């Protein structure tokens, strides 16, 4: 119970942290898609 576990999606514009079986997410940083 750190903050997450399943796989919720983190809206951060241009990228996404995504959730994992351990809270800690993965945020990528490259560019933003067309709105």
Curated annotation (Swiss-Prot):
It comes from the Eukaryota. Residues 1-35 form the Pacifastin domain. The record marks 29-30 as: Reactive bond. Disulfide bonds join 4-19, 14-32, 17-27. In vitro, is active against alpha-chymotrypsin and trypsin. This is Protease inhibitor SGPI-1. The lineage of its organism: Eukaryota, Metazoa, Ecdysozoa, Arthropoda, Hexapoda. The chain holds residues 20 to 54 of 92 of the full protein.
């Amino acid at each position: 119970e750190q903050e997450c576990t399943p796989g919720q999606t983190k809206k951060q514009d241009c990228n996404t942290c995504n959730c994992t079986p351990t809270g800690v997410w993965a945020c990528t940083r490259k560019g933003c898609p067309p709105h």
